[PDB]
């Protein structure tokens, strides 16, 4: 309301300021059908995203708000949308009012409107599956994000807790030092889909660090979909919440038979 509904959305990147459509050259000749580079080897292909979402800054009314659009702007999340207030999709953190609109729709496709698939991708990356309502992200690749600063093991979690708290309500955040990776679980799936594209290829630097001028030189972190939590301290919480979900559905379902009779 005061932070979001009061203002209008702002142009994040100028349309001249947008990156070039060709990728960085990792081959000898450019391929025109498949917009990639062909001959020779294939190098790396991952780079730090130059752009990042400042959520309390860039949120505002847009064109999709008056139209009743259901879906969020993909390049609002990357910090890359050049249309600003003239864009057909939404430019704000998903809320309970917003996911209530997506409730019939979230089952088969994400908050960005892209269709979910049958099974997960091999590296658990990408959009996701409709078969599992996954609400947990695997925050990985943290060394290339931090530009190989050491720091400690719990300060890394402090960077994770500050950044992902702006991207929605959180169920829990777990960091594992031995695996150098984090597990962030959200209240809703739509926040998790939103924060996944928001934090792909980003860096946890906070310009109070000395490498802030060299934030671009790194690799960038991987936010991917999480697998199941293998400890039985969490497994028993899964079937406990699945039980409560089933009891909340049966009360709703006997009222269908009450009206059916």
Partner 1 sequence: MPRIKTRRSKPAPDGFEKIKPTLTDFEIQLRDAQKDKSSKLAAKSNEQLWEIMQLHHQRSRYIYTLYYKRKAISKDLYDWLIKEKYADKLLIAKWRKTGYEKLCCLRCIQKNETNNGSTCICRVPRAQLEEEARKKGTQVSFHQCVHCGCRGCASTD
Partner 2 sequence: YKDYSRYQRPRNVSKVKSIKEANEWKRQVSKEIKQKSTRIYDPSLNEMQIAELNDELNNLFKEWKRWQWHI
Partner 3 sequence: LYTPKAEMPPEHLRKIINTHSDMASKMYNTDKKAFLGALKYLPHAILKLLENMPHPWEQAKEVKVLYH
- List residues near partner 1 by CB under 8 A: 15, 18, 21, 63, 66-68, 82-83
Name the DSSP letter for residue 169. -
Find the angle CA(183)-CA(175)-CA(238) to the nearest 5 degrees: 45
Q: Which helix (H) or strand (E) holds 175?
A: strand 170-176
Among 4, 8, 11, 27, interactor with partner 2 by CB under 8 A: 27
Return d(Cα 249, Cα 135) in angstroms, integer.
20
If one asks whether residue 26 binds partner 2 (CB under 8 A), the answer comes out as yes
Residue 152: partners with Cβ closer than 8 Å, 6 or more residues away: none
**22 is in the binding site of which of partner 1, Zn ion, partner 3, none (Cβ under 5 to 8 A by kind)?**
partner 3
115: which strand partners? Answer: 109
* Nearer to partner 2 (CB atom), residue 7 or residue 46: 46
What is the SS3 assignment for 17? coil
Q: What would the x/- binding string for partner 2 be over residues 28 to 47, using CB under 8 A? A: x-----------xx------
* Nearer to partner 2 (CB atom), residue 27 or residue 113: 27
Scanning 28-36, 78-86, 123-131, 206-214 for contacts with partner 3 by CB under 8 A, the matching segment is: 28-36
Using the structure block, give the residue that is written with the tokens 């025109």: 32
Among 17, 22, 24, 235, interactor with partner 3 by CB under 8 A: 22
* Nearer to partner 1 (CB atom), residue 2 or residue 66: 66
Closest CA to 160 of 177, 92, 237: 177
């Amino acid at each position: 309301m005061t932070s979001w509904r009061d203002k209008s959305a702002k142009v994040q990147v100028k349309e001249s300021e947008l990156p070039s459509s060709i990728p960085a050259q990792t081959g000898l000749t450019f391929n025109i059908w498949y917009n990639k580079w062909s001959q020779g080897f294939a190098g790396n292909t991952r780079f730090v995203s130059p752009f990042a979402l400042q959520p309390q800054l860039h949120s505002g009314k847009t064109r999709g708000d008056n139209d009743g659009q259901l879906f969020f702007c993909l390049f609002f999340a990357k910090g890359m949308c050049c249309l600003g207030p003239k864009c057909e999709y939404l430019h704000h953190i998903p809320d309970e009012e917003d996911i209530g609109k997506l409730a019939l729709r979230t089952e088969v496709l994400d908050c960005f409107g892209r269709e979910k698939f049958a099974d997960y991708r091999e590296d658990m990356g990408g959009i996701g599956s409709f078969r599992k309502k996954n609400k947990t992200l695997y925050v990985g690749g943290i060394d290339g994000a931090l530009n190989s600063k050491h720091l400690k093991p719990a300060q890394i979690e402090s960077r994770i807790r500050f950044v992902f708290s702006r991207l929605g309500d959180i169920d829990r955040i777990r960091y594992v030092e031995s695996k150098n990776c984090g597990f962030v679980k959200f209240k809703y799936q739509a926040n998790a889909e939103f924060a996944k594209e928001a934090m792909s290829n980003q860096t946890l630097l906070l310009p109070s660090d000395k490498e802030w001028d060299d934030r671009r030189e790194g690799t960038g972190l991987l936010v991917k979909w999480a697998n199941e939590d293998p400890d039985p301290a969490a497994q028993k919480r899964l079937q406990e919440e699945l039980k409560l979900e089933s009891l909340n559905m049966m009360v709703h379902l006997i009222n269908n038979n009450t009206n059916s009779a």
